[PDB]
Amino acid sequence: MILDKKFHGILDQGEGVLIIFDEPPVDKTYEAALETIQNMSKVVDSLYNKAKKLT
Amino acid sequence: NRHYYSITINYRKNELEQKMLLNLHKKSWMEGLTLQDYSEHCKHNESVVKEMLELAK
Amino acid sequence: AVQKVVVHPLVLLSVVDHFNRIGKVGNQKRVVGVLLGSWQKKVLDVSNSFAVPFDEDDKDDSVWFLDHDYLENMYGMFKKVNARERIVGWYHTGPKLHKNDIAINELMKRYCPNSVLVIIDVKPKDLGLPTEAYISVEEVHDDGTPTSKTFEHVTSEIGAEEAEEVGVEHLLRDIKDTTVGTLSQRITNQVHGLKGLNSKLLDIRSYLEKVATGKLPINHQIIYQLQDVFNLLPDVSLQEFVKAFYLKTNDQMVVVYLASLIRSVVALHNLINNKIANRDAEKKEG
């Protein structure tokens, strides 16, 4: 059920220690990574227009 | 305009009105101790502005 | 009772008129003006005011000259032309609080309701806010001193409702609006250290002077709360706030990626037009 991600937790065999944690700011790295991936096409297309007009 | 004309208008301001009203308006856009509402936004950058940064993105 | 007050710049420009109609006589004493406002709502709102001939004595401070007929006539005619505003209190232009102000304020405490007091400066050289609302209420003291009139500082703000903003903005043509961004922020971030430096440096010198050279109890009881709040920040070791520096510095990284990426997007039209315009204008010029 942790592999199913229904709640926050992780098991243990050697020590049996239970740890519960969460990561609230999920909407930052998604929007940032999408801006990087979308801007890659912008810079590459710019290099296509300049590479087309120069050579 | 027939039988009814007008006249030009100019202004005048001495240094007491300039500094009293100028510093009074700058203070009217400033704080009391001028250090109060700075940390409010400095620490609102982590709570409220994050929503404005996500929406900005 | 009252948490905050609202003072329009019209009364302070009427103090500019107090400094205009002097006539170069050589007195320039604490001319007392009859402050007007709206005491109905919990918040105080000053719209306009007027003045009364006020003269004191050179040596004796207990001398004060007011007028009841002029107050009832100016207030009667002002109420006849505008009945939405009534008497609230008064204000003096003197920078120092004299002992006679309890007797001057006592008249408008008897005849008028609880009057608020405002101390301003004759010269607009003070960088701080010139208006300080001092409520005239009697407070019980813990040391056992007899109950007397106490002037507690009430916070004040200088705002205009509809027209005075337009008139001030047109008469100045030099001040700038909010204008969020680089200049309005960096000016505050540059001069703010002087804005606290002149206040604290101007206060703690006479404070430290009155520490050793002081008598006539200055309410030393509040000094314990003063140094207490000053010792409420005992140079934190910043151990727990490290992760907070990682959060604010991570937002800094977000601003880095936004600046670099967005400016890199802005470089498109420039770094394209610079070529397609120059080479085509050059190849088609002749």
Which key phrases capture this entry?
part of a larger assembly, 3 chains, A: 55 residues, mainly alpha, 1 helix, B: 57 residues, 0% strand, elongated, 26S proteasome non-ATPase regulatory subunit 14 (chain B), ubl conjugation (chain C), isopeptide bond (chain C), JAMM/MPN+_dom (chain C)
Report on the structure:
Chain A: Belongs to the proteasome subunit S9 family. Chain A: It comes from Homo sapiens. Chain A: It is found in: Nucleus; Cytoplasm, Cytosol. Chain A: This is 26S proteasome non-ATPase regulatory subunit 11. The structure is cut from a larger assembly and holds chains A (55 residues), B (57 residues) and C (286 residues). Chain A is mainly α. Chain A is built from one helix and no strands. The longest helix of chain A has 28 residues. Chain B is built from three helices and no strands. The longest helix of chain B is centred in the middle third of the chain and has 14 residues. Chain B is elongated. In chain C, the strands form two sheets. In chain C, strands 3-1-8-7-6 form a five-stranded mixed sheet. Chain C has a three-stranded antiparallel sheet with strand order 4-2-5, sandwiched between helices. Chain C is an alpha/beta fold.
Topology diagram in text:
The structure is cut from a larger assembly and holds chains A (55 residues), B (57 residues) and C (286 residues).
Chain A: H1 27-54
Chain B: H1 15-28, H2 36-44, H3 49-56
Chain C: E1 4-7, H1 9-18, E2 32-37, E3 44-46, E4 49-51, H2 69-81, E5 86-92, H3 101-110, E6 116-118, E7 133-138, E8 149-158, H4 164-172, H5 183-212, H6 221-230, H7 242-283
Parallel strand pairs in C: 1-3, 1-8
Antiparallel strand pairs in C: 2-4, 2-5, 6-7, 7-8
PDB class: hydrolase
Keywords: p28, 26S proteasome, regulatory particle, 19S, gankyrin, hydrolase
Entry title: Conformational Landscape of the p28-Bound Human Proteasome Regulatory Particle
Q: Provide the β-strand percentage band of chain B.
A: under 5%
Main structural class of chain A: mainly alpha
Q: Note the run of SSEs of chain A as H and E.
A: H
Biggest interface and which pair forms it? B-C, 27 and 32 residues
Our Rg estimate of chain B from Cα atoms comes to 23 Å
Q: Report how far the terminal alpha carbons of chain B are from each other.
A: 58 Å
Subcellular location (chain A): Nucleus; Cytoplasm, Cytosol
Organism (chain A): Homo sapiens (Human)
Family (chain A): Belongs to the proteasome subunit S9 family.
Protein name (chain A): 26S proteasome non-ATPase regulatory subunit 11
